[PDB]
Amino acid sequence: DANRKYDYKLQYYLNDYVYAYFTLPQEGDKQQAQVEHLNSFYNFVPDVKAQGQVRNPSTLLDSQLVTVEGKVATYKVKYKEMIQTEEKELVTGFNIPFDEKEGKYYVSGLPWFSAIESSQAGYFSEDDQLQLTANDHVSDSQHKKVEKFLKVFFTNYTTNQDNLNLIAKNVAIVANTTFKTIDYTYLKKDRADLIAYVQATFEVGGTTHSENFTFTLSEKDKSYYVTKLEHTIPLNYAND
Amino acid sequence: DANRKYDYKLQYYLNDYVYAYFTLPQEGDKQQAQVEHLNSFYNFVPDVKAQGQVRNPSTLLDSQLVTVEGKVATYKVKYKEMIQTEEKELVTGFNIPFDEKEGKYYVSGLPWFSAIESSQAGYFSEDDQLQLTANDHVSDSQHKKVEKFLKVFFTNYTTNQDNLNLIAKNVAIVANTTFKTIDYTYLKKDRADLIAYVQATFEVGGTTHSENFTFTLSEKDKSYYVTKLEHTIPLNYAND
Amino acid sequence: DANRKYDYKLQYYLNDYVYAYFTLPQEGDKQQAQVEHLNSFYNFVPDVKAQGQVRNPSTLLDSQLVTVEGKVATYKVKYKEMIQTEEKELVTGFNIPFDEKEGKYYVSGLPWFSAIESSQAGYFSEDDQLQLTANDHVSDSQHKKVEKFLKVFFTNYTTNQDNLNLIAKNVAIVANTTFKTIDYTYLKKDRADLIAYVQATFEVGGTTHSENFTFTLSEKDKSYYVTKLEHTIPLNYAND
The missing domain is CATH 3.10.450.540 (Nuclear Transport Factor 2; Chain: A,)
Known part of the structure; x- marks a missing residue:
């Protein structure tokens, strides 16, 4: 009972990555500093062949860690993006490749977006x-x-x-x-x-x-x- | 270690049901649409013999999934109800009958309210x-x-x-x-x-x-x- | 599958203690009443040799239950303290000694602060x-x-x-x-x-x-x- 062991370090590490990924403030002092913190999650900042991305300010509204399997964490994500200015709410599945070295964690490459899958059952007999x-x-x-x-x-x-x-x-x-x-x-x-x-x-x-x-x-x-x-x-x- | 498997789809499904159950907006466009989303959780919308309920606008403030056993999920719930207008904070235990078909989930009947039970121990010897x-x-x-x-x-x-x-x-x-x-x-x-x-x-x-x-x-x-x-x-x- | 058993009473008990510990309202009606609720978590209010503490109003902003082992729960905590008035955001690790009696829980002594440990891996080979x-x-x-x-x-x-x-x-x-x-x-x-x-x-x-x-x-x-x-x-x- 009271001596049970729980370790949630991986689940909260992944939550912190999702927050870092989907959070981008407006002011530059804040913005490049949030990008540096995001980059700190990777073993190496992923090699991207494009010159750069178009980035808009964004806020994480909600996230659910639904599965971890085969060194991939899958989230449901809700966020809002400010386009300069209109605010748009968006949802996506979000998939994080990660690994573990000496009891510590890192993100191992470019994450990928997916369509949110509902776990709602249907097709019941009367x-x-x-x-x-x-x-x-x-x-x-x-x-x-x-x-x-x-x-x-x-x-x-x-x-x-x-x-x-x-x-x-x-x-x-x-x-x-x-x-x-x-x-x-x-x-x-x-x-x-x-x-x-x-x-x-x-x-x-x-x-x-x-x-x-x-x-x-x-x-x-x-x-x-x-x-x-x-x-x-x-x-x-x-x-x- | 890094290859551990986690599946939290059931826990987040139940969280989404609690949110759908305790959330009712003011404007009709929003209100009947939130009721349709709530009804989507059931295998069948439960048979209710009353003509209807009195429903007031409501917001979920907090929820804790404390137990799952014997196809019943038990929550501690905090919400607020707007009575037309006064706002009242309320707490209740909330019990959800559910089941699983082909790895998907559904709510199987009318949920039930219970008094919140504290897990605080007492009666200690000096x-x-x-x-x-x-x-x-x-x-x-x-x-x-x-x-x-x-x-x-x-x-x-x-x-x-x-x-x-x-x-x-x-x-x-x-x-x-x-x-x-x-x-x-x-x-x-x-x-x-x-x-x-x-x-x-x-x-x-x-x-x-x-x-x-x-x-x-x-x-x-x-x-x-x-x-x-x-x-x-x-x-x-x-x-x- | 659907008959799996989950019990999260301990995790939410500890979350409720962290909230009670890091929450102190301004008005006295509210303040001494929040202290009484905090004291209810202990088997006995811990013996403190100092005459009293300096206490400032405070709000919990975030908490992560990262580990439970050997009857110690460890959190990452984010809070804000109002010093009379300036508001200051603070982070700390927070360690709770607890135990279990007849399936119920209590905090068993003075908790302790620690420096937040990152689970970020480093030192990778090119x-x-x-x-x-x-x-x-x-x-x-x-x-x-x-x-x-x-x-x-x-x-x-x-x-x-x-x-x-x-x-x-x-x-x-x-x-x-x-x-x-x-x-x-x-x-x-x-x-x-x-x-x-x-x-x-x-x-x-x-x-x-x-x-x-x-x-x-x-x-x-x-x-x-x-x-x-x-x-x-x-x-x-x-x-x-």
Whole structure:
């Protein structure tokens, strides 16, 4: 535990290179001095056959170190360039060849730009879509006993830890929340347990949001005790 | 070393979801467009039984990805909500169900709010409390020789690496510091070594702070050589 | 994959301590209250023999958690101190002794300042320097066929994925780029393949930059197909 070792020197070295690369101030005192600091990252300033570049003042707005593999670090970069004057926001992937000598780091050649790749998945089957459209086969009198219990549960859940402890196992109260409404309830028996799949509305500051729950309910006296609580409803919820 | 592989795509995907979730601009062109980008994170936009939510403009101020386990990412979140107009700062825990398909990621259902949990430890025994209250059994003449040596040590420590090298093994000088005072010294023999437990005051810019040291001192000529330096004093320091 | 476990509670605990340590507001309501929050990090507020410190208002500008080892966390810190009034930017290394009790954390004693250490490597042999100075032994008629092909390649590379797919294996187009010029070409046979070591200039927004490439070219009809593309030129490129 407390004796674990972490070394983030490489990740922060690469962050410092990205900052040095995408940062160019306006005033010359500042500008050539920032270029010297950028050049300090290389083993050797890369050999460039062009006479020079067109350079505009620029500010780094954001960077994400997404991958390191095979001595290449890949970033997502957001920056702004002042063209003399208009300011333009730009994004690019940015790829840094680097290496290590005696536990120290350097950039080993000209970096390269790439198109940002999204890690967003797509192409899902409609079989994977949760819809809370099922109607359960539990009595209207059990529904009304469960609804009364759930209103007490969510009131305690948003207010009072000791009140919540009496009716639930190892559930923490939430902060800065008001319980508004129960919007869906599907009930299913599992031997002596009653399973409740529930959606409810909460207000935090001035904003409302909905959340899902799976309650495992045991009968206690004339009410219930929550032996288990989850914060998702599974696709198979209405498979009884 | 330099060929290590790092993949942070999941951590930054989740950061981008938190930003998309807690960011809502004022102007409609911007607002519905930010909602579309938020919706792009889901496999399917979650089924919500309420007609709609009350939504206010909001800005993300800070987020910490504290845990990922069992396909749930947990954040500490700081944001501000503009209620039309007053601005209110809010904090919450925020829990994201997600999954992975073919090396890509998605949010799999309604996230849930939780109370922020502190990782601060408490309930310590007074046995664990360091107090620099002990009086050593070393002569006043050794104390004065050690005090003179320690003033040279701390002067060099704050000034001159080559001067420091003559009187200490593998100690680096500190930058931007002035040595002010030695505030505590406990001396103890360990065979031929003299151990010095020391607190001293330093000034950095306009501010003073105290630090602790454990010196291991060897006799060199009519003075000392520091064979070892630590930056803590142990609870057992006055167990001779 | 999606079931991986991450725990960053220690790293963010230490970030919160650094923020608490280097943050001191102006107004007393705020100031003594920030000191109480700072003191909450310790198992016990450290025993300090000085009567007190000189404290000035201060803001944390940046911090990097570079190492954790042997119950010491080491940071690079940037802050600013208001001396009453002038503002001064300062940098320091900052070292935190900490420990863990029952999965929770605490700071165990007085932290210590250190000089920032750069992870920049130096002292390279000129043998390791890439210079694009070699002249190849390939015919001027092959050079002109390759130059025409490379202008098509870089046009597609900056424009049209489907056009690029016809002439290259698994190469992604770049975004927001205009191809300007080929500035260096070294050609070498490798059995039936032709290797091209190339530098080219690109414009992104208002700014130009150079990049290096190693193409592996197969003959296709009266032109070429790129079977492999790298974004570096190796030191041995002109060893035929």
